Design a protein around this nucleic acid. Structure first.
Ligand SMILES: [Cl-]
Ligand SMILES: [Cl-]
Ligand SMILES: [Cl-]
Ligand SMILES: [Cl-]
Ligand code: NA
Ligand code: NA
Ligand code: NA
Ligand code: NA
Ligand code: NA
Ligand code: NA
Ligand code: NA
Ligand code: NA
Length: 327
DNA sequence: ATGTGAGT
DNA sequence: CAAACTCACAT
């Protein structure tokens, strides 16, 4: 499926429009849910009325489906795609920190392009100015090779700080991807657990260190548990400077760390299959904890975890290398 | 204290 | 994966 892709693409495009251009949250979700229930449907849809049988597909989407099936297009959508305001809003919204709200306010004031934004930084917050500054860099893919260099700096700086620190770079990179959008590091320390006294300094000290060595270059945000900023590989002497990259560093309690590393290594299909097989065996898995599931169905109290291996063991699956976590 | 916003 | 959850900024 496959089957009804044209209709689902149609609705995903209507959703985006309602979220990013109207600011009608309920219509956005209405379209998301409709696109989802349709993508699950086993038959090639032939009428709006057939789709209307599906929960979440109502009168109005049935009408649109009818037009789409008849002509292969949707007038509403062709108008949206020709609309400059909509195009501009979607463009601005590609700057990190700029979402639909700021986007409206900016296009309303005639600010629509990168050049335009760079002439109106007084209109932007810190996050958004960082996003404009590295707009091009942040849109480049990161090759595995640089990801690997980056991974070493943080893993090394972290070790030399405190050998008890555990730091892991996750996402598709961890599954062996050839390129990456950004770097998502999960961090923990054995004297930081869920039953303990909350220690921001654990994160802050490694952020500060990565700033000392001039690896972290800008901060988008930094709280007690979550850091989001910008990094840059060092360039030798003069010559060509590396592009600035997005990096997040998240501090997780030690007793929830590996569910974290698992959840955030993906893939989504692999997670879905994993947390669904876990149901079959009688356990619920989220990003934090794996818990058993009683006869009633509702149950809790987390099981002790100290590796990804453990989680696999609980649900009676052989361990799967991150390389093999496609599905 | 609360609400809006943004990103993951 | 949507939803939840962090954090920034305002008032
Ligand atoms: Cl202007
Ligand atoms: Cl501002
Ligand atoms: Cl990579
Ligand atoms: Cl995983
Ligand atoms: Na808007
Ligand atoms: Na709905
Ligand atoms: Na009904
Ligand atoms: Na409609
Ligand atoms: Na963005
Ligand atoms: Na100005
Ligand atoms: Na990543
Ligand atoms: Na943050």
């Amino acid at each position: 499926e496959t089957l009804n892709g044209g209709i689902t693409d149609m609705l995903v495009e209507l959703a985006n429009f309602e979220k990013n251009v109207s600011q009608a949250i309920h219509k956005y979700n209405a379209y998301r849910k409709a696109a989802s229930v349709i993508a699950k449907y086993p038959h090639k849809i032939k009428s709006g009325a057939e789709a209307k049988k599906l929960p979440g597909v109502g009168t109005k989407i049935a009408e649109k489906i009818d037009e789409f099936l008849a002509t292969g297009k949707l007038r509403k959508l062709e108008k949206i795609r020709q609309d400059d305001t909509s195009s501009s809003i979607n463009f601005l919204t590609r700057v990190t920190g700029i979402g639909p709200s700021a986007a409206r306010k900016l296009v309303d004031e005639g600010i629509k392009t990168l050049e335009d934004l760079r002439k109106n930084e007084d209109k932007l917050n810190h996050h958004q100015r960082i996003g404009l500054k590295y707009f091009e860099d942040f849109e480049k893919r990161i090759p595995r090779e640089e990801m690997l260099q980056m991974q070493d700096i943080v893993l090394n700086e972290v070790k030399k700080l405190d050998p008890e620190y555990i730091a892991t770079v996750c996402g598709s990179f961890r599954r062996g991807a050839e390129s990456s959008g950004d770097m998502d590091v999960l961090l923990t320390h054995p004297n930081f657990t869920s039953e303990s006294s909350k220690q921001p300094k654990l994160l802050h000290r490694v952020v500060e260190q990565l700033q000392k060595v001039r690896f972290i270059t800008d901060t988008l945000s930094k709280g007690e548990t979550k850091f989001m900023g910008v990094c840059q590989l060092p360039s030798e002497n003069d010559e060509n400077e590396y592009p600035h990259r997005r990096i997040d560093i998240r501090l997780i309690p030690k007793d929830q760390y590996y569910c974290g590393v698992l959840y955030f290594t993906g893939s989504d299909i692999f997670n879905k299959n994993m947390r669904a097989h876990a149901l079959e065996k009688g356990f619920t898995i989220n990003e934090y904890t794996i818990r058993p599931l009683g006869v009633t169905g509702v149950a809790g109290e987390p099981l002790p975890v100290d590796s990804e291996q453990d989680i696999f063991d609980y649900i009676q699956w052989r361990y799967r290398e991150p390389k093999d976590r496609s599905e």
